[PDB]
């Protein structure tokens, strides 16, 4: 009817207002602001340790707080927890559902998370037992596949699902406290800002939304990507974040200008992006591609900081330790590689 | 100390050995078109999974389904739900990460189709072109059945599915169409014969033989 018509007209007017407001705040560009800085040059990183022992393709990974232990999720149905320094196993968790699309490590180092094409977030506690791994709580309130999950401190966990909605979960009560609605496609990746107060979420609608944990309403929407966003990571400062996409691009979005600050792409790249993550100082943006490698991009100069070779299959997960000592990447070749 | 960590890692790897044995023994299968189903046939593990509990957005959870032996694609031979199955099959065949997966195509609801085609209810010729220019193939097995009109349409849908299969997928793709709708318990057997050929053709290529 005509009611939807003038409502869409008002929405278009508001979009034009947001666009011209963004344009009015574009006095400079990251390229010329950074131009005077010394180029980082070629950075060489070599495989320190290869972590073998998984069966199927590894889909997600997450470092621990102490930069010692990482958890790996594979579609074989395992949640093997690694020890990077001495390349052994700490725990091996068999999953009720064979397909897992995400895993999280609690900052307290007491709980682990998984989830996938089962619409349930399973929480496994690694401390209270006499030595075992048991499902402490199963969070079933999602109508789509879980794509990413992150603990807040020890009891609140935010989950991104294919149900077009994110959600905040209270583990102890096993209830969905707040829901995050407003996306259009399936939500793939969410990144928590340091000193957790608000988180981002990039979905298949080529848009990343910034959500407030307490308020529950998204603050700003960043629509600059051509295609689906497969990964997103917060810049260490907390006023910026970088988003991967299937458009063969990584774009750094600032929080205080609501704009894309720099485009990280090359004409020799056609494949999409699987996972992105910043370094300790935010100088290097590491990005895993479908070109079988994990290109390293300088976060200010938009230049190839160094080509990072590796797995014989597609990389899907890529993470950096909190102390920034090493970078761990996991691929579909059932292998985790540690680089420094 | 390090001794305890080494012992724990050794025990975990020992368990992972049996896990590898079971995982290699079990063959996974996707049911697409219409959550878990394990069935035993000739003493080999088989695992069926239907993922109908997710939304119609299919492009990004199907990326997670590429180690399966085959994708079993069931269609209704009766909106035009036929081309929707055709377009879905095109996406499966041509996908980058599904490029090494064979399809065990099942043309279900043949009896519903057969009851439909006995009069001009919804003419396929007026619904799909190049029907009046298509006849039953010589290398066919119509068998004793209904009016030879239905088997002409019966084989036309299979032929159209196959033109997609033979247009790409040099050696990692093979389509295995079947004509089945009635519950007779040999359908699962038809899957066993299909999955045997999939692994057999996989090994023939892997040894640079086929």
């Amino acid at each position: 009817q005509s009611e939807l018509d003038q409502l869409r007209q008002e929405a278009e007017q508001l979009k034009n207002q947001i666009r011209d407001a963004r344009k009015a705040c574009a006095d400079a560009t990251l390229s010329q602001i950074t131009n005077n800085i010394d180029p980082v040059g070629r950075i060489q990183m070599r495989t320190r340790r290869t972590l073998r022992g998984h069966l199927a393709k590894i889909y997600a990974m997450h470092w621990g707080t102490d930069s010692r232990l990482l958890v790996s999720a594979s579609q074989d149905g395992k949640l093997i927890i690694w020890d990077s320094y001495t390349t052994n196993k700490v725990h091996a968790i068999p999953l009720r559902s064979s397909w897992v699309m995400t895993c999280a490590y609690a900052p307290s180092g007491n709980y682990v998370a998984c989830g996938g094409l089962d619409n349930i977030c399973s929480i496994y506690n690694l401390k209270t037992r006499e030595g075992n791994v048991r499902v402490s709580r199963e969070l079933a309130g999602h109508t789509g596949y879980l794509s990413c999950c992150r603990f807040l401190d020890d009891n609140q966990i935010v989950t991104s699902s294919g149900d077009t909605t994110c959600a905040l979960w209270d583990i102890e009560t096993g209830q969905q406290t707040t829901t995050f609605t407003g996306h259009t496609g399936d939500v793939m990746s969410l990144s928590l800002a340091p000193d957790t107060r608000l988180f981002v979420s990039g979905a298949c609608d080529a848009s990343a939304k910034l959500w407030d944990v307490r308020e529950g309403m998204c603050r700003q929407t960043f629509t600059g990507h051509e295609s689906d966003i497969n990964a997103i990571c917060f810049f260490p400062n907390g006023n910026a974040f970088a988003t991967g996409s299937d458009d063969a691009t990584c774009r750094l979005f600032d929080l205080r200008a609501d704009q894309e600050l720099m485009t990280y792409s090359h004409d020799n790249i056609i494949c999409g992006i699987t996972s992105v993550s910043f370094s300790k100082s935010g100088r290097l943006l590491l990005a895993g591609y479908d070109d079988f490698n994990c290109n390293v991009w300088d976060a200010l100069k938009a230049d190839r900081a160094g080509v990072l070779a590796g797995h014989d299959n597609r990389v899907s997960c890529l993470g950096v330790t909190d102390d920034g000592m090493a970078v761990a990447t996991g691929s579909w070749d059932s292998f985790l590689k540690i680089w420094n | 100390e390090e001794k305890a960590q080494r012992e724990a890692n050794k025990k975990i790897e020992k368990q992972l050995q049996k896990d590898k044995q079971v995982y290699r023994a079990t063959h996974r299968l996707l049911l697409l078109g219409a959550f878990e189903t394990k069935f035993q046939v000739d003493k080999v593990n088989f695992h069926m999974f239907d993922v109908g509990g997710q939304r119609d957005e299919r492009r990004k959870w199907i990326q997670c389904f590429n180690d399966v032996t085959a994708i079993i694609f069931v269609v209704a031979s009766s909106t035009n739900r036929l081309q929707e199955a055709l377009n879905l099959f095109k996406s499966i065949w041509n996908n980058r990460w599904l490029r090494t997966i064979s399809v065990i195509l099942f043309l279900n609801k043949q009896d519903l189709l057969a009851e439909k085609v006995l009069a001009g209810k919804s003419k396929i010729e007026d619904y799909f072109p190049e029907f009046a220019r298509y006849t039953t193939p010589e290398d066919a097995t119509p068998e004793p059945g209904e009016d030879p009109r239905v088997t002409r349409a019966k084989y036309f849908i299979r032929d159209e599915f196959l033109r997609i299969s033979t247009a790409s997928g040099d050696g990692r793709h093979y389509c295995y169409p079947h004509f089945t709708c009635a519950v007779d318990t040999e359908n699962i057997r038809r899957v066993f014969n299909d999955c045997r050929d999939i692994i057999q053709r996989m090994h023939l290529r892997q040894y640079e033989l086929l």
Partner: nanobody
Framework: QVQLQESGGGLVQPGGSLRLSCAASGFTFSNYKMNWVRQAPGKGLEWVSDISQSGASISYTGSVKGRFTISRDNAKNTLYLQMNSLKPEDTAVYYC?????????????????????RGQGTQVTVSS
């Protein structure tokens, strides 16, 4: 954004000719396969036709083959698909939609809404 504004349509007597033009913005046109999806009242979304990046690989729905033709102008970032000899059964809300991934030969587009890479469409009615 990825806005895809569609034009044309309206009320056309059966057997006539009518043209749709869909404008593309926010993405590189040459990198994406594009296709039209229609939705008759009550009925669900049905794929009409698709065209490759270079305009070579072109296919149509059987019910519309021989009547509709699809062509794209990469320089102008517009997609055209023509009516010829319209029938009362083709009244629908035609949409212009984009393949989700760039430089890909497979698409998963037709969905019960919740698909961002598709415009709001233009209503076409053939009643006379």
């Amino acid at each position: 954004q990825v806005q895809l504004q569609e034009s044309g349509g309206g009320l056309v007597q059966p057997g006539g000719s009518l043209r749709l033009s869909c404008a593309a913005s926010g993405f590189t046109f040459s990198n994406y396969k594009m296709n039209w999806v229609r939705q008759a009242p009550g009925k669900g979304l049905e794929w009409v036709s698709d065209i490759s990046q270079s305009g070579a690989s072109i296919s149509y729905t059987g019910s519309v083959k021989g009547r509709f033709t699809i062509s794209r102008d990469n320089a102008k970032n517009t997609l055209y698909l023509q009516m010829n000899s319209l029938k009362p059964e083709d009244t629908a809300v035609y949409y212009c939609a984009r393949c989700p991934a760039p430089f890909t030969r497979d698409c998963f587009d037709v969905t019960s809404t919740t698909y961002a890479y598709r415009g709001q469409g233009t209503q076409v009615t053939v009643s006379s």
